[model samples]
Target: HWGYGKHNGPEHWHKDFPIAKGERQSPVDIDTHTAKYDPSLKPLSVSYDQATSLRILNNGHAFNVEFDDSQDKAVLKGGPLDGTYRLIQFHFHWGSLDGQGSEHTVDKKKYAAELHLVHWNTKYGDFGKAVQQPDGLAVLGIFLKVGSAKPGLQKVVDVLDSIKTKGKSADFTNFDPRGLLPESLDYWTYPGSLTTPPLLECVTWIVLKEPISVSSEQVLKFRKLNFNGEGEPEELMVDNWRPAQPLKNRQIKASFK
Candidate 1:
C-alpha cells in the first residue's frame, strides 16, 4: 500500500487529508542557476558534544531524536540570525520503495533520504515552549545518498532491533547526533513552512547541499518500520517523504562563509 499505485498511495493521501495539498513540501529540484548568492550569511557553529545529546525516539513513522535541553549548541550570531537556537527534535523522510528517497529535490534529482534537525528560538525562553511561537522554529536538512559499505551510521543500525517494532523506542544511551552531520556545514537557507500538519511558514531552513552516504542495508532497516504497532505484520513504511513545492516568490539563500 505504500508503493505507487491506486487507493492507499501518496497521490491519494490528499483525498483523506485535504491539508496535505497545502503542506509546505520538500525534495524539490535545486537549481543553482535560479538561486542567488547572499554575501552576509554565516555558518552555524555548534559543538560536537552538544550535538551528541540527541535522544532517539520511535515516532511510529520512523526513528526520531529529541534534543536535550542541557545541550543547546546550534549558534546563530550574525545577519538575520542574531539570537540563540536550541535543538528540539530530529526526524526523516524517505520513499516507500527503493531508488527514491529525500524530501528536497535538486535539479529534479532525488537522493536516498533526508534528515531534519528541528530547533527553536531560545530567545523566547526554553525550546520546549518556544515551538509555539511563530518565528521560533529552525529546521536543518541533511541529504542522504546511496553507497556501498556502511555510511558510519551503524551507531543507529546497531540498535535497530531494540525498536524494530512500532511505538517501541529505547534509550540510545551515550549516543551523539553530531556523528551524523556531514563534513561540510555549508547550507542553503530559505523561509518555509513545516512539511507536516499545521504547516506554519515561520521556519528558517538550512539545508546542506553536500550529502552523506549510507548503505542499502541501513536503508532496509528504515523500511522495516510500521505505521501500526508491535505484533502486527511488518508493514513497509518506506516513501514517507513529500515532494518539493513552489517558492512563491520567496528567496532561498546560502551560508558558505
Candidate 2:
C-alpha cells in the first residue's frame, strides 16, 4: 500500500501529484458565524440515479469516477456562482491510518475523509476541452466523519481488496455517486485554485457545511490499501489531509437564506 511517509503526504503532494495543483483544491475553513453579506445561492436539485453517470477509472489516484453528462443540469445559475458546468470526476483524499482522513479543514477540524466531486464548464465543449480553460472547473467538497456503520460504501470499499495494490483498479458497476453526498445541500461557495499540482486559478469551490458519517472500520479499510502495488501489507493511511489554505482576499458565500 502507498503509505504517507515523511515526504509522501499533502505537503509533498504538489511535487508528485502535480495535477493536484491544477484542480480545485479544498480544506478551506468555513466560518458560519461570520456575517452573511452575499445573496443566497440555490443548490441544484438532482435525482440520485438520474443526475449522474458513473464509471470507475484507474487514474493512479486510486478509485475515481467519470461522472456522466447528466450532471451538467445541476448548474449554479447566478450570483458569484455563474456558468454551467458538468460533473466530470469524483475521488477522495484519505489518511495513512484511521482517525484522520479528509483533504480540507475548517478551524483545524479534521474529518475522517473528504470526497471531491469534480465538474467542468460546458463553455469548454466537454470535460476534456473544459479542463484547459480558465474558470472551466468547479469542485464540491464533502466532509466525511466517523459515524454509524453503513453498508452503502461497501460497494466501493468491498472492491478495495481487489485493488489493494498501487496503480490497480477494478471495474465498478451499478452504483450511484449521489448516495455518498450528505442529506443537506447547504454549502459555502468561493473562488479558488486546485489543491493538486499545476494548481490553476480556474475553480469555483462549493463546500458543504454539513458532514456525513462513516465507520472506523471503514476508514481502516481504506488505509489497508497500498500505493506501491498489489499484494503488499497494509500501510498506515492516517493524516492524509491538507492544512487550511489562505482565503487570499477571496470572498466565500453561503447558500443559506
Candidate 3:
C-alpha cells in the first residue's frame, strides 16, 4: 500500500522501509556545474530488437512496458557500466503539472516528466536476484519536455487507453527501445537507490542530458491513468515521482562533453 499521500509518501517511506534513508538514494539533483567530466567513461551501447517488446501494463504506481530479456535480445553496454545489462522493463514518473514531476533535477529545475528504463546485470542471472546486489542494476533516466509532438512516442500513447486502469495490460510488440532515446548520448551517472519504497541501493543511474519532446497533451495522458481499478474510488496518477535526494559522498560522472 505504498502510495503518494501524506501517510505513505516519500517523506514517510523510511518509517516502513529504512532503506528509504539509505546512502545511495535515487532521484538526486544532477548539478552539471559540479559534476565531474570523466573522459574515461564509455559511450552507451544499446541494441534493442523490436520483437522483444512483450506488453504494457498499469502496475498501479505507473505504466510499465515489459520486454522479454530472457536472452540477449536487448542489452545495454558501456557508459558507467563494465559488463552487459539485460533490458527488463521500462516505466515512468510524473506530476499533475508541467513544472514538476521529474525525479532528478538539473540545477534544481524540474521537467514535465521522467522515464526509467530498468535493466539487470547479466552476472546476476535474473532480475529478481540481480536487484539485491551492488552492481546488479542499471537504469537509464530520460527527462521528457512538453513541446513538440514526439513521433517515437505515438506507439506508447496509442496503448494508454487500453491500459488506463490498474492491473490492466495490452499486447505491445515490435517496438525498438532505441527509438525513444535522444540524439545525444551525453549523460551524468551516479549510484542511487530506487525512488519508490523498499528503495534498494543497487542502481547505477545514467541520466541523459538532452530531453526528448512531447506535446502537453501527450504528457496529460499519463496523469489520466487510474491508480485504482474499476468500480473503486479513482485516484489520478499524478505526482508519482519522489523528490530529489541528497548526494552524500557519491560523485556523478559525465559521459560526454
Candidate 4:
C-alpha cells in the first residue's frame, strides 16, 4: 500500500500511479509576489449545515469527517466555480513537527497543518461521476498555524481516541465546519490535483490566505493516531503530506489585491 514510508512514500507514488508526475499536480508553492489579482474573481460562497455531519473515519492516510450529500443542505459555490458543489468530506495533512506540515506553502513557508474541505460538482450528478471530469471538484484549503486553542477544533480532537487505528470510525454529528474558517475569505486559486494517490488533476484549489489557530497541544492529539490497523504494528500518522509540485504553465490568481 502507498504510505509516507521510506520505501512507499510520495517519491515512489509515480511508480504505481503514473499520473503523480502529470502536469498540473497539486500542493504547489504559492509564490505570493507573482500571484495575479483577478478583479473578476467572485468571493467564495459557502453554506454548511450542522446536521449534515455524519461520521469521522480514520482512513489510514488521514482522518476524514464525512457529510450527508443526499441533498444540497451543504455546499460551496462561486469563486472559481461555475456551479454548485456538494460537500462530501473534509480532512487534514500534518507533519511530525510544527515548522513543516502543510501541503501547499505560501512564499514557500509551511504551516503546522492544512485542512481540505472536499466538494463535488452538482453538474456531474454524483461524486463518483464527478471525479472523472476536468472541473469536477472544488477543495477549500485552510492553513492551520500552531497558536491559541481553537474551540472549533476541539470537537474533532475529542473524538480522536475512538478512532486511533486504521478503518476505525465514530458517529460525528451537528458540527458546522464554517466555524473553522478564518475571518477573511481572501484566497489564491489555481488548477491542481489531489495530493494523494491516483492524484486526479480535477480540482480547483482555493487556498485561504489567512490561517486559523490550532494549539500545539491539539496537534499532539492528531499524532496519537495509528496508520496501522488495530492488531498490526503501530505507525504514527505524521508527515502525511506530499511535497510541492512544479507549477508548469498554471497561474495562481488572488481574490483580493
Best by TM-score: 4
TM-score-best of 1 and 4: 4
Predicted model with the maximum lDDT: 4
* Better structure of 1 and 2 per TM-score: 1
Give the per-residue lDDT of model 3 (tens digit) for 115-158.
99999999999987988998899999999999998888889988
Per-residue CA lDDT of model 1 for 73-166, tens digit only, reads 5443343455776776677777655567787777777888898877778787876466456567777788888785444578777776677666
Per-model lDDT: 0.67, 0.64, 0.89, 0.94
Evaluation by TM-score, superior candidate among 2 and 4: 4
Q: Write the per-residue lDDT of candidate 2 for residues 31-134, one digit (tens) a residue.
A: 66662545556545433444544556443344576556744543433434566666666777776554566766665677778888887777778765665666
- Candidates in order, TM-scores: namely 0.84, 0.80, 0.97, 0.99
**Distance (Å) between predicted and true CA of 29, model 4?**
0.2
lDDT of 1 at 111: 83
Stretches > 4 Å off in candidate 3: none
Worst lDDT run of 10 residues, candidate 2, spans: 71-80
Summing lDDT over every window of 10 consecutive residues in candidate 4, give the lowest-scoring window. 42-51
* Segments of candidate 2 deviating more than 4 angstroms: 1-5, 12-26, 35-37, 51-60, 69-80, 97-99, 231-238
Q: How many residue pairs clash in each candidate?
A: 15, 27, 1, 0
